[PDB]
Design a protein around this ligand. Structure first.
Ligand SMILES: Nc1ncnc2c1ncn2[C@@H]1O[C@H](COP(=O)(O)OP(=O)(O)NP(=O)(O)O)[C@@H](O)[C@H]1O
Ligand SMILES: OC[C@H]1O[C@@H](O)[C@H](O)[C@@H](O)[C@@H]1O
Ligand SMILES: [Mg+2]
Length: 456
């Protein structure tokens, strides 16, 4: 009991997110949104111009391929599109898990593995897909890392995030990197668009619902994109676009702010991370990191309060051994003896048996960790709504979501929705909609490759 409670009291203190604070944080997010838009050097929110001035209409048609590369897997995709009525006539896809090594080897090894799937996936092309003879297959590239765009279809990698760390490629143009690798496979294809996963998901959403203003990811990582007025971007240099509109990638993963309620655990996780100092907000909320925070809190407990016996289990000292899908397993156990939770602990801590009070303390720790992440992510979405002036009534505003964290972690999902609504107040909340646009970055990129064909 009592040694355990001192450290839980300390977690509760440190992780606290009283709504008042959440609004504080939302505000800060907007300030930072503004600094990023002013080219303000070393703004933590980059607010990257996508070169996307037109989101999908509906009216798109043709064959288009997409390649979506993520934190933990990539997808190859095709769609046959038949205009405003028929729309999305046919679509296939393959998803492959990225091998750990390819996160941390060479650029070449990576895009080769990607391209090789793409190539073998194209072969299997049925005949409910077709493209005028003479013609070249075109391809939308979803790239789930922060790029500095140079055109719709070109851009240089700023920095790797969330478990990637490949030395060659920072500062290089990623589409050229893909292209070389594709052609090394004897694969005639063009990249006609290059987008972040948040942008893709915004395009996919808008294609089925015209009131989509924004898209958040909550998966291995977290990030958000929204449609911004081009005349509200000081660092814009050039001709304004016809639409009056530019989609921004906030890269809010990199938000930091004294207002963020952080712990030793968060400090230590960062210290031993692939990208120390970076993506500090993300590391409080996204899926690559939640299980690891839980582990570290449990490790303090096993040490300072014998929580799991007189010796701490070896396995509990392994970094990353407790993943976030395991965490949501434990979290959603409603049994009286917490059976299922216990089965997971046995498995992960490599222990034989568990106190039932120990099982209730684990569940509590899971609760605090997911709760902070979800409440903080809600503050971010509220931040966006503020930027769009849809935080108030005088209007239907849809926010597209994607990512396994959000799709599969039920309590994380509903904590985020309850809190968003709390922040918006009643009146304003009836205006906004959070909708699953799962695997939406993939299609969103094909759609945008359409608008930018070399053909009509
Ligand atoms: N059942 C689950 N409970 C909680 N989290 C989950 C669950 N399933 C998956 N996740 C998280 O979400 C991720 C699953 O893949 P996905 O959401 O497609 O992200 P990704 O494309 O690999 N990387 P990113 O593009 O940054 O989201 C994993 O990294 C997990 O951390
Ligand atoms: O996948 C969700 C997000 O993860 C973040 O950590 C990446 O830096 C973003 O580029 C991406 O949108
Ligand atoms: Mg994705």
């Amino acid at each position: 009991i009592p040694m355990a409670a001192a450290v839980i009291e300390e977690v509760e203190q440190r992780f606290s997110t009283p709504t008042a604070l959440l609004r504080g944080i939302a505000d800060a997010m907007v300030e930072e949104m503004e600094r990023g838009l002013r080219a303000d050097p070393h703004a933590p929110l980059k607010m990257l111009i996508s070169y996307v001035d037109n989101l999908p209409t509906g009216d798109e048609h043709g064959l288009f391929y997409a390649l979506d590369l993520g934190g933990t897997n990539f997808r190859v995709i095709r769609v046959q599109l038949g205009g405003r009525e028929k729309r999305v006539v046919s679509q296939q896809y393959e998803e492959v898990a990225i091998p750990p090594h390819l996160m941390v080897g060479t650029s070449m090894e990576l895009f080769d593995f990607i391209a090789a799937e793409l190539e073998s996936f194209v072969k299997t092309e049925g005949e409910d897909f077709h493209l005028p003879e003479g013609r070249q297959r075109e391809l939308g590239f979803t790239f789930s890392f922060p790029v500095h765009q140079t055109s719709i279809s070109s851009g240089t990698l700023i920095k790797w995030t969330k478990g990637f760390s490949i030395n060659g490629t920072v500062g290089e143009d990623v589409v050229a990197e893909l292209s070389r690798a594709m052609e090394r496979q004897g694969l005639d294809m063009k990249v006609t668009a290059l987008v972040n996963d948040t942008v893709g998901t915004l395009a996919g959403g808008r294609y089925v619902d015209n009131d989509v203003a924004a898209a958040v990811i909550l998966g291995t990582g977290t990030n958000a994109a929204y449609v911004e007025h081009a005349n509200a971007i000081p660092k814009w240099t050039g001709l304004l676009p016809r639409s009056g509109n530019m989609v921004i990638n906030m890269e809010w993963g990199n938000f930091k702010s004294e207002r963020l309620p952080r712990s030793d655990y968060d400090n230590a996780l960062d210290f031993e991370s692939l990208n120390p100092g970076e993506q500090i907000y993300e590391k409080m909320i996204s899926g690559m990191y939640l299980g690891e925070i839980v582990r570290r809190i449990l490790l303090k407990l096993a040490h300072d309060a014998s929580l799991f016996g007189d010796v701490v289990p070896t396995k509990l000292e392994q970094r990353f051994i407790l993943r976030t899908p395991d965490m949501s397993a434990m979290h959603h156990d409603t049994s009286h003896d917490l059976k299922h939770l216990g089965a997971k602990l046995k498995d992960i801590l490599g222990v034989a048996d568990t106190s039932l009070e120990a099982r209730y303390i684990t569940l509590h720790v899971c609760d605090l960790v997911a709760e902070r992440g979800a409440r903080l992510a809600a503050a971010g979405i509220y931040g966006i709504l503020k930027k769009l002036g849809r935080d108030r009534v005088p209007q239907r505003t849809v926010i597209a979501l994607d990512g396994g964290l959000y799709e599969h972690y039920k309590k994380f999902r509903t904590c985020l929705e309850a809190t968003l609504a709390d922040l918006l107040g009643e009146e304003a909340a009836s205006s906004v909609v959070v909708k699953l646009a799962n695997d939406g970055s993939g299609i969103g990129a094909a759609l945008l490759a359409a608008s930018h064909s070399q053909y009509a």
